[PDB]
């Protein structure tokens, strides 16, 4: 029985470097040699209390790819669970008597953790609770960096945009911090700087990091260019546009980038990466999303199948 068998995957922080390595390895193998019937007679619930098409299609595709069966919903007043009286607990207490696993996304922090206390031997995978721990998101990012860079240590990582409210970046920073010798470059407007608790963490481990006003300063030495999503709401329409300066990427900016450097972006993109970047060799956000399939396939495999080989 693999270390992750029948385990709940709720927070990226609950995973040890060994776990990460284990998931990452399984993904490469399933990618190299597909296993269509691995989860043949299994039924998995895709419960999206909160809609998220992209992530939903991704998880569900992963499920079918392993031969698993899927039941679920993309709740948004499209179902009858919303009936405010009924608790999430009671809902999980029911759905967990139906299926072999629960993949769930919810607008509230802690949703998946709580679910864990009401499901019973039925593992729950956290799509994402609003604002906290989107596991499979960081795993696909890590997997994509590892594949393109060939490793996860001694890398120069730049993260641009809204680093204050960007959980995919908080999650990815903490994960990469479980590997040695990485160098971080944080580019963002003061109003959305990387939270001080993240920097404290990097300091505790003696990890090198520095702040920069624009991508131009670092470009020449970055191996990974992680572009973030900047919602106009976190700011004033005038403040946005205004500061939006050079926190957006254009092909021009890539004139002196390193041949291996890859540009990544949680997929909702616009007002961040100019389309003239799509044709360069550095663009890798669509490939990134494409890797969600293997990372999520790997997770389901390890959790629902006792001993998976190559």
């Amino acid at each position: 029985a693999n270390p992750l068998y029948q385990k709940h995957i709720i927070s990226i922080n609950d995973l040890s470097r060994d776990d990460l390595n284990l998931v990452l390895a399984t993904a490469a193998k399933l990618k190299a040699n597909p296993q269509p019937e691995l989860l043949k007679h299994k039924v998995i619930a895709s419960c999206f209390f909160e809609a998220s098409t992209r992530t939903r299609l991704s998880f569900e595709t992963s499920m079918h790819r392993l031969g698993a069966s899927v039941v679920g919903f993309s709740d948004s007043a499209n179902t009858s669970l919303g009936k405010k009286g009924e608790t999430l607990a009671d809902t999980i207490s029911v759905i967990s008597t139906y299926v072999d696993a629960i993949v769930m996304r919810h607008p509230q922090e802690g949703a998946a953790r709580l679910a864990t206390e009401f499901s019973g031997n039925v593992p729950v995978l956290n799509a994402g609770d609003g604002s906290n721990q989107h596991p499979t998101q960081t795993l696909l990012d890590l997997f994509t960096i590892q594949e393109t860079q060939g490793r996860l240590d001694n890398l120069h990582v730049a993260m641009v945009g809204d680093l204050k409210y960007g959980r995919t970046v908080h999650s990815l920073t903490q994960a990469l911090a479980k590997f040695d010798g990485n160098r971080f470059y944080f580019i963002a407007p003061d109003a959305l700087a990387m939270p001080q608790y993240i920097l404290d963490m990097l300091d505790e481990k003696g990890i090198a990091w520095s702040l920069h006003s624009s991508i131009e300063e670092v470009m020449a030495e970055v191996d990974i260019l992680y572009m973030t999503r900047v919602q106009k709401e976190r700011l004033d329409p005038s403040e946005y546009a205004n500061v939006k300066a050079q926190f957006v990427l254009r092909a021009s900016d890539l004139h002196n980038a390193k041949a291996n450097m890859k540009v990544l972006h949680p997929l909702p993109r616009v007002d961040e990466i100019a389309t003239d970047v799509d044709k360069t060799p550095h663009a890798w956000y669509f490939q990134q999303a494409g890797n969600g399939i293997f990372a999520r396939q790997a997770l389901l495999a390890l959790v629902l199948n006792r001993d998976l080989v190559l």
Binding site: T87, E117, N132
Partner: protein, 153 residues
């Protein structure tokens, strides 16, 4: 080992005693820890003077003992409290509260979007000490706060 009884303090036999309690912390311990929810005898004293200056609160529960974890669950409210155990009609134990690593069923999460609020679960926070402040992390939303924020519900 005798029978000499006093007054300004009730010293009955066989019970746990909570001595030295900051003003306005006694009644909270009672509420928060459901200490009156029993049939065993209970002697309570509020605004009663004791050694250290000012005023304090006193709680005594006949025929009932608190574990080590329970005593600690008082550190956040009564840091200078004394918990003398009693049997043989005398002191057969003593201990002072020490900040736990975990605190449940008593605190409320400051985060309004935390799942723990409308749900049938017990609150739970991880504890960490630091300069002029205690940091409490929620088991559910995994958000972190200062005890001065969490105790201001």
């Amino acid at each position: 080992m005798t029978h000499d009884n006093k007054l300004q303090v009730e010293a009955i036999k066989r019970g746990t005693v909570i001595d030295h309690i900051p003003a306005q912390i006694g009644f909270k311990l009672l509420s928060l820890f459901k200490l009156t929810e029993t049939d065993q005898r209970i002697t309570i004293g509020l605004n009663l003077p004791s050694g250290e200056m000012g005023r304090k609160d006193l709680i005594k529960i006949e025929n009932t003992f608190l574990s080590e974890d329970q005593v600690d669950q008082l550190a956040l409210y009564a840091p200078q409290a004394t918990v003398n155990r009693i049997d043989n009609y005398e002191v057969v134990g003593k201990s002072r509260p020490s900040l736990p690593e975990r605190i449940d069923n008593v605190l409320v999460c400051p985060n309004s979007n935390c799942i723990s609020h409308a749900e049938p679960v017990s609150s739970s926070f991880a504890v960490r000490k630091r300069a002029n402040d205690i940091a409490l992390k929620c088991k559910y939303c995994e958000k972190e706060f200062s005890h001065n924020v969490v105790l201001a519900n």
